[PDB]
Amino acid sequence: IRELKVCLLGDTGVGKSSIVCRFVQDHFDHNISPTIGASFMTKTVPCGNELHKFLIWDTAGQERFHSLAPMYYRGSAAAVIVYDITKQDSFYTLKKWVKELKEHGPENIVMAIAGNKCDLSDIREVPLKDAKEYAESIGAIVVETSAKNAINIEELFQGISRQIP
Ligand SMILES: Nc1nc2c(ncn2[C@@H]2O[C@H](COP(=O)(O)OP(=O)(O)NP(=O)(O)O)[C@@H](O)[C@H]2O)c(=O)[nH]1
Ligand SMILES: [Mg+2]
């Protein structure tokens, strides 16, 4: 068993809790309420010839909670930074989280970007190519996901697993 601390960063409403909830519980609630404080969940996944037990810290995205964020991301093997493909604002917040992360988190932290709500493509505001370049220009992976339709949730975490010895 290889314990991996992962933290979720992103603006409110982007789907951080929905992603974890899909990953861990294989469940989606359209009426999932916001997170107050933080939420911890865990899932063990076989990767190569070793087990990866993800210790997932799903942080509350709301403004009043930013002041509590360094507590969860410090000591993290990886950080999942989530935007909402349907709101471009959520994509600039992603950049502000990346910055804080390169300044206050582990020197060697795995960066993964999730372009959540990809099922709402008919209202897309963030092209995949723009997110792919940004990810490449920061040594991060990018996957467009949908917690709703279970698209690339498992793959998002296979992305983290792949970038570790
Ligand atoms: N269509 C669609 N809706 C989604 C998807 N993921 C999340 N949502 C919806 O988006 C809303 C916010 O989801 P949530 O997971 O709470 O986001 P959050 O970033 O965790 N919220 P908070 O930051 O306040 O804790 C909810 O209504 C949720 O059902 C998705 O892939 N597709
Ligand atoms: Mg939440």
Coordinates of N, CA, C and O and ligand atoms in Angstrom, one line a residue:
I1 N 0.9 -1.2 0.0 CA 0.0 0.0 0.0 C 0.9 1.3 0.0 O 1.8 1.4 0.8
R2 N 0.6 2.2 -0.9 CA 1.3 3.4 -1.0 C 0.3 4.5 -0.8 O -0.5 4.8 -1.7
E3 N 0.4 5.2 0.3 CA -0.5 6.3 0.7 C -0.2 7.5 -0.1 O 1.0 8.0 0.0
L4 N -1.2 8.1 -0.8 CA -0.9 9.3 -1.5 C -1.9 10.4 -1.2 O -3.2 10.3 -1.4
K5 N -1.4 11.5 -0.6 CA -2.3 12.6 -0.2 C -2.5 13.5 -1.4 O -1.6 13.9 -2.1
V6 N -3.8 13.7 -1.7 CA -4.3 14.5 -2.8 C -5.2 15.6 -2.3 O -6.1 15.3 -1.4
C7 N -5.1 16.8 -2.8 CA -5.9 17.9 -2.5 C -6.7 18.4 -3.7 O -6.1 18.5 -4.8
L8 N -7.9 18.8 -3.5 CA -8.7 19.4 -4.5 C -8.8 20.9 -4.4 O -9.3 21.4 -3.4
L9 N -8.4 21.6 -5.5 CA -8.5 23.0 -5.5 C -9.3 23.5 -6.6 O -9.2 22.9 -7.7
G10 N -10.0 24.5 -6.4 CA -10.8 25.1 -7.4 C -11.9 26.0 -6.9 O -12.3 25.9 -5.7
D11 N -12.5 26.8 -7.8 CA -13.5 27.7 -7.4 C -14.8 26.9 -7.0 O -14.9 25.7 -7.2
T12 N -15.7 27.6 -6.4 CA -17.0 27.0 -6.0 C -17.8 26.6 -7.2 O -17.7 27.2 -8.2
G13 N -18.5 25.5 -7.1 CA -19.4 25.1 -8.1 C -18.7 24.3 -9.3 O -19.4 23.8 -10.1
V14 N -17.4 24.3 -9.3 CA -16.7 23.6 -10.4 C -16.9 22.1 -10.4 O -16.9 21.5 -11.5
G15 N -17.1 21.5 -9.3 CA -17.4 20.0 -9.2 C -16.4 19.2 -8.5 O -16.3 17.9 -8.7
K16 N -15.6 19.8 -7.6 CA -14.6 19.1 -6.8 C -15.2 18.0 -6.0 O -14.8 16.8 -6.1
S17 N -16.3 18.2 -5.3 CA -17.0 17.2 -4.5 C -17.6 16.2 -5.4 O -17.7 15.0 -5.0
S18 N -18.1 16.6 -6.6 CA -18.8 15.7 -7.4 C -17.8 14.7 -8.0 O -18.1 13.5 -8.1
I19 N -16.6 15.2 -8.3 CA -15.6 14.3 -8.8 C -15.1 13.3 -7.8 O -15.1 12.1 -8.1
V20 N -14.9 13.7 -6.6 CA -14.4 12.8 -5.5 C -15.6 11.8 -5.3 O -15.3 10.6 -5.2
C21 N -16.8 12.3 -5.2 CA -17.9 11.5 -5.0 C -18.2 10.5 -6.1 O -18.7 9.4 -5.8
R22 N -17.8 10.8 -7.3 CA -17.9 9.9 -8.4 C -16.8 8.9 -8.3 O -17.1 7.7 -8.4
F23 N -15.6 9.3 -8.1 CA -14.5 8.5 -8.0 C -14.7 7.4 -6.9 O -14.5 6.2 -7.2
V24 N -15.0 7.9 -5.7 CA -15.0 7.0 -4.5 C -16.3 6.2 -4.4 O -16.3 5.0 -4.2
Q25 N -17.4 6.9 -4.6 CA -18.7 6.3 -4.4 C -19.5 5.9 -5.6 O -20.6 5.3 -5.5
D26 N -19.0 6.2 -6.8 CA -19.7 6.0 -8.0 C -21.2 6.5 -8.0 O -22.1 5.9 -8.3
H27 N -21.3 7.8 -7.5 CA -22.6 8.4 -7.3 C -22.6 9.9 -7.7 O -21.5 10.6 -7.5
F28 N -23.7 10.4 -8.2 CA -23.8 11.8 -8.6 C -25.1 12.4 -8.1 O -26.2 11.8 -8.4
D29 N -25.0 13.5 -7.4 CA -26.2 14.1 -6.9 C -26.2 15.5 -7.5 O -25.4 16.4 -7.2
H30 N -27.2 15.8 -8.4 CA -27.4 17.1 -9.0 C -27.6 18.2 -7.9 O -27.3 19.3 -8.1
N31 N -28.2 17.7 -6.7 CA -28.4 18.7 -5.6 C -27.4 18.6 -4.5 O -27.8 18.9 -3.3
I32 N -26.2 18.1 -4.8 CA -25.1 18.1 -3.8 C -24.9 19.5 -3.3 O -24.8 20.5 -4.0
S33 N -25.0 19.7 -1.9 CA -24.8 21.0 -1.3 C -23.3 21.3 -1.3 O -22.4 20.5 -1.5
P34 N -23.0 22.7 -1.1 CA -21.6 23.1 -1.0 C -20.8 22.5 0.3 O -21.5 22.1 1.2
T35 N -19.5 22.4 0.2 CA -18.7 21.9 1.2 C -18.4 23.0 2.2 O -18.0 24.1 1.8
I36 N -18.5 22.8 3.5 CA -18.2 23.7 4.6 C -17.0 23.1 5.3 O -17.1 22.1 6.0
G37 N -15.8 23.8 5.2 CA -14.6 23.2 5.8 C -13.9 22.4 4.8 O -13.3 22.8 3.8
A38 N -13.9 21.0 5.0 CA -13.3 20.1 4.1 C -13.9 18.7 4.2 O -14.7 18.5 5.2
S39 N -13.6 17.9 3.3 CA -14.2 16.5 3.2 C -13.2 15.6 2.8 O -12.4 15.8 1.9
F40 N -13.0 14.5 3.6 CA -12.0 13.5 3.3 C -12.6 12.2 2.8 O -13.6 11.6 3.5
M41 N -12.1 11.6 1.8 CA -12.5 10.3 1.2 C -11.3 9.6 0.8 O -10.2 10.2 0.5
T42 N -11.4 8.3 0.6 CA -10.3 7.5 0.2 C -10.7 6.3 -0.7 O -11.8 5.7 -0.6
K43 N -9.8 6.0 -1.6 CA -9.9 4.9 -2.6 C -8.6 4.3 -2.9 O -7.6 5.1 -3.1
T44 N -8.5 3.0 -2.8 CA -7.3 2.3 -3.2 C -7.4 1.7 -4.6 O -8.4 1.1 -5.0
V45 N -6.4 2.0 -5.4 CA -6.3 1.6 -6.8 C -5.0 0.9 -7.2 O -3.9 1.5 -6.9
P46 N -5.1 -0.3 -7.8 CA -3.9 -1.0 -8.2 C -3.2 -0.2 -9.3 O -3.9 0.2 -10.3
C47 N -1.9 0.0 -9.2 CA -1.2 0.8 -10.2 C 0.2 0.1 -10.5 O 1.1 0.2 -9.6
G48 N 0.4 -0.5 -11.6 CA 1.6 -1.2 -11.9 C 1.7 -2.4 -11.0 O 0.7 -3.2 -10.9
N49 N 2.8 -2.5 -10.3 CA 2.9 -3.6 -9.3 C 2.9 -3.1 -7.9 O 3.8 -3.4 -7.1
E50 N 1.9 -2.3 -7.5 CA 1.8 -1.7 -6.2 C 0.4 -1.0 -6.1 O -0.2 -0.6 -7.0
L51 N -0.1 -0.9 -4.8 CA -1.4 -0.3 -4.5 C -1.3 1.2 -4.2 O -0.4 1.6 -3.4
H52 N -2.2 2.0 -4.7 CA -2.2 3.4 -4.5 C -3.4 3.8 -3.7 O -4.5 3.8 -4.2
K53 N -3.3 4.1 -2.4 CA -4.4 4.5 -1.5 C -4.4 6.0 -1.5 O -3.6 6.6 -0.9
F54 N -5.4 6.6 -2.3 CA -5.5 8.0 -2.3 C -6.2 8.5 -1.1 O -7.3 8.0 -0.7
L55 N -5.6 9.5 -0.4 CA -6.2 10.2 0.7 C -6.6 11.5 0.2 O -5.8 12.4 0.0
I56 N -7.9 11.6 -0.1 CA -8.4 12.7 -0.8 C -9.0 13.8 0.1 O -10.0 13.5 0.8
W57 N -8.4 15.0 0.0 CA -8.9 16.2 0.7 C -9.6 17.1 -0.2 O -9.0 17.9 -1.0
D58 N -11.0 17.1 -0.2 CA -11.9 17.9 -1.0 C -12.2 19.2 -0.2 O -13.0 19.1 0.8
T59 N -11.5 20.2 -0.6 CA -11.7 21.5 0.1 C -12.9 22.3 -0.4 O -13.3 22.2 -1.5
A60 N -13.5 23.1 0.5 CA -14.6 24.0 0.2 C -14.0 25.1 -0.7 O -13.0 25.8 -0.4
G61 N -14.7 25.3 -1.8 CA -14.2 26.3 -2.8 C -14.6 27.8 -2.5 O -13.9 28.7 -3.0
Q62 N -15.6 28.0 -1.7 CA -16.1 29.3 -1.3 C -15.0 30.2 -0.7 O -14.2 29.8 0.1
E63 N -15.0 31.5 -1.1 CA -14.0 32.6 -0.7 C -13.5 32.6 0.8 O -12.3 32.7 1.0
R64 N -14.4 32.4 1.7 CA -14.1 32.4 3.2 C -13.2 31.3 3.6 O -12.6 31.3 4.7
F65 N -13.0 30.2 2.7 CA -12.2 29.1 3.0 C -10.8 29.1 2.5 O -10.0 28.2 2.8
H66 N -10.5 30.0 1.6 CA -9.1 30.1 1.0 C -8.1 30.2 2.1 O -7.0 29.6 2.0
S67 N -8.5 30.9 3.2 CA -7.6 31.0 4.4 C -7.3 29.7 5.1 O -6.5 29.7 6.0
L68 N -7.9 28.6 4.7 CA -7.7 27.3 5.3 C -7.0 26.3 4.4 O -6.6 25.2 4.8
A69 N -6.8 26.7 3.1 CA -6.3 25.9 2.0 C -4.8 25.3 2.2 O -4.6 24.1 2.0
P70 N -3.8 26.2 2.7 CA -2.5 25.7 2.8 C -2.3 24.5 3.7 O -1.4 23.6 3.6
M71 N -3.2 24.4 4.7 CA -3.3 23.3 5.7 C -3.4 21.9 5.0 O -2.9 20.9 5.4
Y72 N -4.2 21.9 3.9 CA -4.5 20.6 3.2 C -3.5 20.3 2.0 O -3.2 19.2 1.8
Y73 N -3.1 21.4 1.4 CA -2.2 21.1 0.2 C -0.7 20.9 0.6 O 0.1 20.4 -0.2
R74 N -0.3 21.4 1.8 CA 1.1 21.1 2.2 C 1.1 19.7 2.6 O 0.2 19.1 3.3
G75 N 2.2 19.0 2.2 CA 2.3 17.5 2.5 C 1.5 16.7 1.5 O 1.4 15.5 1.7
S76 N 1.0 17.3 0.4 CA 0.3 16.6 -0.6 C 1.2 16.1 -1.8 O 2.0 16.8 -2.3
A77 N 1.0 14.8 -2.1 CA 1.7 14.2 -3.2 C 1.3 14.8 -4.5 O 2.0 14.9 -5.5
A78 N 0.0 15.1 -4.5 CA -0.6 15.7 -5.7 C -1.8 16.6 -5.4 O -2.3 16.7 -4.3
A79 N -2.1 17.5 -6.4 CA -3.2 18.4 -6.3 C -4.0 18.4 -7.6 O -3.5 18.6 -8.7
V80 N -5.3 18.2 -7.4 CA -6.2 18.2 -8.6 C -6.8 19.6 -8.6 O -7.5 20.1 -7.6
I81 N -6.6 20.4 -9.7 CA -7.1 21.7 -9.8 C -8.2 21.6 -10.9 O -8.0 21.2 -12.0
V82 N -9.4 22.0 -10.5 CA -10.6 21.8 -11.3 C -11.2 23.1 -11.8 O -11.3 24.1 -11.0
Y83 N -11.5 23.2 -13.0 CA -12.3 24.3 -13.5 C -13.6 23.8 -14.1 O -13.8 22.5 -14.1
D84 N -14.5 24.7 -14.6 CA -15.8 24.3 -15.1 C -15.7 24.8 -16.6 O -15.6 26.0 -16.8
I85 N -15.7 23.8 -17.5 CA -15.5 24.2 -19.0 C -16.5 25.1 -19.5 O -16.3 25.6 -20.7
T86 N -17.5 25.4 -18.7 CA -18.6 26.3 -19.2 C -18.5 27.7 -18.7 O -19.3 28.5 -19.2
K87 N -17.6 28.0 -17.8 CA -17.4 29.3 -17.3 C -15.9 29.6 -17.3 O -15.1 29.1 -16.6
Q88 N -15.5 30.5 -18.3 CA -14.1 30.9 -18.4 C -13.4 31.5 -17.2 O -12.2 31.2 -16.9
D89 N -14.2 32.2 -16.4 CA -13.7 32.7 -15.1 C -13.0 31.6 -14.2 O -12.0 31.9 -13.7
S90 N -13.7 30.5 -14.2 CA -13.2 29.3 -13.4 C -11.8 28.9 -13.9 O -11.1 28.2 -13.2
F91 N -11.5 29.2 -15.2 CA -10.2 28.9 -15.8 C -9.1 29.8 -15.4 O -7.9 29.4 -15.4
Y92 N -9.4 31.1 -15.1 CA -8.4 32.1 -14.6 C -8.1 31.8 -13.1 O -7.0 32.1 -12.6
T93 N -9.2 31.4 -12.3 CA -9.0 31.0 -10.9 C -8.1 29.8 -10.8 O -7.3 29.7 -9.9
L94 N -8.1 28.9 -11.8 CA -7.2 27.8 -11.9 C -5.8 28.3 -11.9 O -4.9 27.7 -11.3
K95 N -5.5 29.4 -12.6 CA -4.2 29.9 -12.8 C -3.7 30.5 -11.5 O -2.5 30.4 -11.1
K96 N -4.6 31.2 -10.7 CA -4.3 31.8 -9.4 C -4.1 30.7 -8.4 O -3.3 30.9 -7.4
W97 N -4.7 29.5 -8.5 CA -4.4 28.4 -7.6 C -3.1 27.7 -7.9 O -2.4 27.3 -7.0
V98 N -2.8 27.6 -9.2 CA -1.5 27.1 -9.7 C -0.3 27.9 -9.1 O 0.7 27.3 -8.6
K99 N -0.5 29.2 -9.2 CA 0.5 30.1 -8.6 C 0.8 29.9 -7.1 O 1.9 29.5 -6.7
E100 N -0.3 30.0 -6.3 CA -0.2 29.7 -4.9 C 0.4 28.4 -4.6 O 1.1 28.2 -3.6
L101 N 0.1 27.4 -5.5 CA 0.6 26.1 -5.3 C 2.1 25.9 -5.5 O 2.8 25.2 -4.8
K102 N 2.6 26.6 -6.5 CA 4.1 26.6 -6.8 C 4.9 27.4 -5.8 O 6.1 27.3 -5.7
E103 N 4.2 28.3 -5.1 CA 4.8 29.1 -4.1 C 4.7 28.6 -2.6 O 5.6 28.9 -1.8
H104 N 3.7 27.9 -2.3 CA 3.5 27.4 -0.9 C 3.3 25.9 -0.7 O 3.1 25.4 0.4
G105 N 3.4 25.1 -1.8 CA 3.3 23.6 -1.7 C 4.6 22.9 -2.0 O 5.5 23.5 -2.7
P106 N 4.7 21.6 -1.6 CA 5.8 20.7 -1.9 C 6.5 21.0 -3.3 O 5.8 21.0 -4.3
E107 N 7.8 21.1 -3.2 CA 8.7 21.4 -4.4 C 8.4 20.4 -5.6 O 8.3 20.9 -6.7
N108 N 8.2 19.2 -5.2 CA 7.8 18.2 -6.2 C 6.4 17.7 -6.0 O 6.1 16.6 -5.4
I109 N 5.4 18.5 -6.4 CA 4.0 18.1 -6.3 C 3.4 17.9 -7.6 O 3.6 18.6 -8.6
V110 N 2.6 16.8 -7.7 CA 2.0 16.4 -9.0 C 0.8 17.3 -9.3 O -0.2 17.4 -8.5
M111 N 0.8 17.9 -10.4 CA -0.3 18.8 -10.9 C -1.2 18.1 -11.9 O -0.7 17.6 -12.9
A112 N -2.5 18.1 -11.6 CA -3.5 17.6 -12.5 C -4.6 18.5 -12.6 O -5.2 19.0 -11.6
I113 N -5.0 18.9 -13.9 CA -6.1 19.7 -14.1 C -7.3 19.0 -14.6 O -7.2 18.1 -15.5
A114 N -8.5 19.2 -14.1 CA -9.7 18.6 -14.5 C -10.6 19.7 -15.1 O -10.9 20.7 -14.4
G115 N -11.0 19.5 -16.4 CA -11.9 20.4 -17.0 C -13.3 19.8 -16.8 O -13.8 19.2 -17.7
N116 N -13.8 20.1 -15.7 CA -15.1 19.4 -15.3 C -16.3 19.9 -16.1 O -16.3 21.0 -16.7
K117 N -17.4 19.1 -16.0 CA -18.7 19.4 -16.7 C -18.7 19.3 -18.2 O -19.4 20.0 -18.9
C118 N -17.8 18.4 -18.7 CA -17.6 18.3 -20.1 C -18.9 17.8 -20.8 O -19.0 17.9 -22.0
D119 N -19.9 17.3 -20.1 CA -21.2 17.0 -20.6 C -22.0 18.2 -21.0 O -23.0 18.1 -21.8
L120 N -21.6 19.4 -20.5 CA -22.3 20.6 -20.8 C -21.5 21.3 -22.0 O -21.2 22.6 -21.9
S121 N -21.1 20.6 -23.0 CA -20.3 21.1 -24.1 C -21.0 22.1 -24.9 O -20.3 23.0 -25.5
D122 N -22.3 22.0 -25.1 CA -23.1 23.0 -25.8 C -23.1 24.4 -25.2 O -23.6 25.3 -25.8
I123 N -22.4 24.5 -24.1 CA -22.2 25.8 -23.5 C -20.8 26.0 -23.1 O -20.4 26.9 -22.2
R124 N -19.9 25.2 -23.6 CA -18.4 25.3 -23.4 C -18.0 26.8 -23.6 O -18.4 27.5 -24.5
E125 N -17.1 27.2 -22.7 CA -16.4 28.6 -22.8 C -14.9 28.5 -22.8 O -14.2 29.5 -23.1
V126 N -14.4 27.3 -22.5 CA -12.9 27.0 -22.5 C -12.6 25.9 -23.4 O -12.8 24.7 -23.1
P127 N -12.0 26.2 -24.6 CA -11.6 25.2 -25.6 C -10.5 24.3 -25.0 O -9.7 24.7 -24.2
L128 N -10.6 23.0 -25.3 CA -9.7 22.0 -24.8 C -8.2 22.3 -25.1 O -7.3 22.2 -24.3
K129 N -7.9 22.8 -26.4 CA -6.6 23.2 -26.8 C -5.9 24.3 -25.9 O -4.7 24.3 -25.7
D130 N -6.7 25.3 -25.4 CA -6.2 26.3 -24.5 C -5.8 25.7 -23.2 O -4.9 26.2 -22.5
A131 N -6.6 24.7 -22.7 CA -6.3 24.0 -21.4 C -5.1 23.1 -21.6 O -4.3 22.9 -20.7
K132 N -5.0 22.4 -22.8 CA -3.9 21.5 -23.0 C -2.6 22.2 -23.0 O -1.6 21.7 -22.5
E133 N -2.5 23.4 -23.6 CA -1.3 24.2 -23.7 C -0.9 24.7 -22.3 O 0.3 24.5 -22.0
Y134 N -1.8 25.2 -21.6 CA -1.5 25.6 -20.2 C -1.0 24.5 -19.4 O 0.0 24.7 -18.6
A135 N -1.5 23.3 -19.5 CA -1.1 22.2 -18.7 C 0.3 21.8 -19.1 O 1.1 21.4 -18.2
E136 N 0.6 21.9 -20.4 CA 1.9 21.5 -20.9 C 2.9 22.6 -20.4 O 4.1 22.3 -20.1
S137 N 2.5 23.9 -20.4 CA 3.4 25.0 -20.0 C 3.6 25.1 -18.5 O 4.1 26.0 -17.9
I138 N 3.1 24.1 -17.7 CA 3.2 24.0 -16.2 C 3.6 22.6 -15.8 O 3.5 22.3 -14.6
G139 N 3.8 21.7 -16.7 CA 4.2 20.3 -16.5 C 3.1 19.6 -15.7 O 3.3 18.9 -14.7
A140 N 1.8 19.8 -16.2 CA 0.6 19.2 -15.6 C -0.1 18.4 -16.7 O 0.1 18.6 -17.9
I141 N -0.9 17.4 -16.2 CA -1.8 16.8 -17.2 C -3.2 17.4 -17.2 O -3.5 18.2 -16.2
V142 N -3.9 17.2 -18.3 CA -5.3 17.8 -18.4 C -6.2 16.7 -18.9 O -5.9 16.1 -19.9
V143 N -7.3 16.6 -18.2 CA -8.4 15.8 -18.8 C -9.7 16.5 -18.6 O -9.8 17.2 -17.6
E144 N -10.6 16.4 -19.5 CA -11.9 17.0 -19.4 C -12.7 15.9 -18.8 O -12.7 14.7 -19.2
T145 N -13.5 16.2 -17.7 CA -14.2 15.2 -17.0 C -15.7 15.5 -16.9 O -16.1 16.7 -17.2
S146 N -16.5 14.5 -16.5 CA -17.9 14.7 -16.1 C -18.2 13.8 -15.0 O -18.3 12.5 -15.2
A147 N -18.3 14.3 -13.8 CA -18.7 13.5 -12.6 C -20.1 12.9 -12.9 O -20.4 11.8 -12.5
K148 N -20.9 13.7 -13.6 CA -22.3 13.4 -13.9 C -22.4 12.1 -14.8 O -23.1 11.2 -14.5
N149 N -21.6 12.1 -15.9 CA -21.7 10.9 -16.8 C -20.5 10.0 -16.6 O -20.3 9.1 -17.4
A150 N -19.7 10.2 -15.6 CA -18.5 9.3 -15.3 C -17.6 9.2 -16.5 O -17.3 8.1 -17.0
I151 N -17.1 10.4 -16.9 CA -16.1 10.4 -18.0 C -14.8 10.9 -17.5 O -14.7 12.0 -16.9
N152 N -13.8 10.1 -17.6 CA -12.4 10.4 -17.2 C -12.1 10.7 -15.7 O -11.1 11.3 -15.4
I153 N -13.0 10.2 -14.9 CA -12.8 10.4 -13.4 C -11.7 9.4 -13.0 O -10.7 9.8 -12.4
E154 N -11.9 8.1 -13.3 CA -10.9 7.1 -13.1 C -9.5 7.5 -13.7 O -8.4 7.4 -13.1
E155 N -9.6 8.0 -15.0 CA -8.4 8.4 -15.8 C -7.7 9.6 -15.1 O -6.4 9.7 -15.2
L156 N -8.4 10.5 -14.5 CA -7.8 11.6 -13.8 C -6.9 11.1 -12.8 O -5.8 11.7 -12.6
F157 N -7.3 10.1 -12.0 CA -6.5 9.5 -11.0 C -5.4 8.6 -11.5 O -4.3 8.5 -10.9
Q158 N -5.6 7.9 -12.6 CA -4.6 7.2 -13.3 C -3.5 8.1 -13.8 O -2.4 7.7 -13.9
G159 N -3.9 9.3 -14.0 CA -2.9 10.4 -14.4 C -1.9 10.7 -13.2 O -0.7 10.8 -13.5
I160 N -2.4 10.8 -12.0 CA -1.6 11.0 -10.8 C -0.7 9.8 -10.6 O 0.5 10.0 -10.4
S161 N -1.3 8.6 -10.6 CA -0.6 7.4 -10.4 C 0.6 7.2 -11.4 O 1.6 6.8 -10.9
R162 N 0.4 7.5 -12.6 CA 1.4 7.4 -13.7 C 2.6 8.2 -13.4 O 3.8 7.8 -13.7
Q163 N 2.4 9.4 -12.8 CA 3.6 10.4 -12.6 C 4.3 10.1 -11.2 O 4.8 11.1 -10.6
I164 N 4.3 8.9 -10.7 CA 5.0 8.6 -9.5 C 5.7 7.2 -9.5 O 5.2 6.2 -10.0
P165 N 7.1 7.2 -9.1 CA 8.0 6.0 -9.1 C 7.3 4.7 -8.6 O 8.0 3.7 -8.7
Ligands
LIG1 N1 -23.8 18.7 -15.6 C1 -22.9 18.6 -14.6 N2 -23.1 19.1 -13.4 C2 -22.1 18.8 -12.5 C3 -20.9 18.1 -12.8 N3 -20.1 18.0 -11.6 C4 -20.8 18.7 -10.8 N4 -21.9 19.3 -11.2 C5 -22.9 20.1 -10.5 O1 -22.3 21.3 -10.2 C6 -22.7 21.8 -8.9 C7 -21.5 22.0 -8.0 O2 -20.9 20.7 -7.7 P1 -19.8 20.6 -6.5 O3 -19.3 19.2 -6.8 O4 -20.5 20.8 -5.3 O5 -18.7 21.6 -6.8 P2 -17.8 22.0 -5.7 O6 -16.7 22.8 -6.3 O7 -17.4 20.8 -4.9 N5 -18.5 23.0 -4.6 P3 -17.9 23.7 -3.4 O8 -16.6 24.4 -3.9 O9 -18.8 24.9 -2.9 O10 -17.7 22.7 -2.3 C8 -23.7 20.7 -8.4 O11 -25.0 21.1 -8.8 C9 -23.3 19.5 -9.1 O12 -24.2 18.5 -9.2 C10 -20.8 17.5 -14.0 O13 -19.8 16.8 -14.5 N6 -21.8 17.8 -14.9
MG2 MG -17.9 20.8 -2.6

